[PDB]
Design a binder for this molecule. Structure first.
Ligand SMILES: [Zn+2]
Ligand SMILES: [Zn+2]
Ligand SMILES: [Zn+2]
Lengths: 150, 150, 150
C-alpha cells in the first residue's frame, strides 16, 4: 500500500499590484504577494491547487484554496492514507520562492498535519523563455507519496 | 523493491476533423476524438505513449499504441513487477478530459490488468498560453509506482 | 520510510559550437556536446541539476555539476537514505539522447554509487513547438524514489 500522486497548475499573471476570471492579488502556497496580480476564478494558488491534485491522484480521486487543502487532509484520513512526503516545484520568473519558502512550507505542514520535514519546495525560473519567462504565467508541478495506514 | 517511473509526450494538434507524420483523427487514452486532428507518426496517443514510458522507466527499460500498453503489461510480468498505481495529467486546451475520463480509465485498467482505482487521470488547460493554449499542441505527463512481486 | 523527489531545469541553447551567464559548450548528463552552446552560470547541465534537485527534494533539503551530484551522494549517506531508482526525461529538439544515453547512465550510476539498472533516461522532442522546439532551450524533469536504510 504505497501510492504516487501528481498535480499541475498554471495561471496567467501580471506584474502590477492589482489596483469567471479576474486579476487579483497573487496567492501562492497560502502566501499573498501584493506586487503581482493573478488571473483566476479562485485565489489562483498554483501550489495549493497542484498539491491538492497530487493528493487526490494518489488516492485515485478527482475561492480560498486552503479550504481544498484541509478537505484533502480529511479525505486522506477517511481513505486510510498517510502522506510519506510531498515535493513541489514552482516554475516562475517572478515571484522568487526563497524569501517566502519557510512560510509556504509552514502553511502546507500545518494544513495537512505533517511536519515541515515532509514538505519540499523549490523555485526555478523559466530562463526568460516563453509566456512564463516573460512574466505572463506561473506554474507548479507537485508530487506526493502516500502510505496506507498502519 | 519499490520503483518510480515517469513519461512525457506532446503532439501538434489542429481543431479540424481530419478530412513520417500526418494529420489524423485524434486518439487519446485509446478514445477517438473525431473533432480534432493530430500530427503523428503513430496514432499520436499522448496518454498511452507517456504511460508506456512511465512503466518502462519504472523498470529501467527504454501505430496503435494500445499494442505498446499490452506489451508493457507482459514486460512487467516478465520482470516481476506489479503496478501500485499510475497518475496521468493531460495538459490541453482541447479536448476536455472529463467527458471521456471514465472511458480512458477503463481502457487503461483493462489493458494493464489493474483496477480502475489504481488509475488517476486529470485534464488541465494551459490558460490559453503558448502553443498548447492556442490549440496547436497537447501533452501528457504520466507517473507510475511499481512494486516487486511478491 | 519511502520518499519521492522531483527536480526541474531549463537552459537556453544555441546550435553553434561556442566559438553571471555565458554561452559555452553544452554538458548534459556529464557528457560534452561540442556542437551546441549553452547559456549558463555553471556548466548548464540540465540533467545533473534536476537530478540533484530530485534527491534533495526527496530528503526535504534545498560550475562542474558532477560536484553537486557527488555531494548528494554524501548527503544521502549522512541522512540514511538509499536510492531505489531515478527516472529522467530530457525534453529537447537537439541533442538526441539515444547516442549518448549509455554514457550519461554510466556517469550517473557511478557518481551516486548505484547500478545502471537503477537509472532510466529518455529523450523527447518538443515536436518543433515553442522555444524548446525552435532549439532555443532544453529542459529536464527528474524523479527519485528513496528508501530509508536499512
Ligand atoms: Zn487553479
Ligand atoms: Zn507519441
Ligand atoms: Zn542549471
Amino acid at each position: 500500500g504505497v501510492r504516487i500522486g501528481q498535480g499541475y497548475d498554471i495561471h496567467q499573471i501580471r506584474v502590477g499590484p492589482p489596483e469567471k476570471q479576474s486579476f487579483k492579488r497573487l496567492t501562492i502556497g497560502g502566501v499573498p504577494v501584493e506586487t503581482i496580480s493573478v488571473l483566476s476564478h479562485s485565489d489562483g494558488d498554483v501550489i495549493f491547487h497542484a498539491l491538492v491534485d497530487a493528493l487526490l491522484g494518489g488516492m485515485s480521486c478527482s475561492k480560498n484554496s486552503l479550504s481544498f487543502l484541509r478537505y484533502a487532509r480529511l479525505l486522506l484520513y477517511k481513505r486510510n492514507y498517510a502522506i510519506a512526503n510531498v515535493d513541489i516545484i514552482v516554475i516562475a520568473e517572478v515571484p522568487k520562492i526563497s524569501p517566502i519558502r519557510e512560510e509556504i512550507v509552514r502553511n502546507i505542514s500545518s494544513a495537512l498535519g505533517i511536519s515541515e520535514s515532509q514538505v519540499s519546495l523549490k523555485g526555478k525560473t523559466h530562463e526568460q523563455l516563453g509566456p512564463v519567462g516573460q512574466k505572463k504565467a506561473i506554474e507548479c508541478f507537485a508530487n506526493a507519496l502516500l502510505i496506507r495506514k498502519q
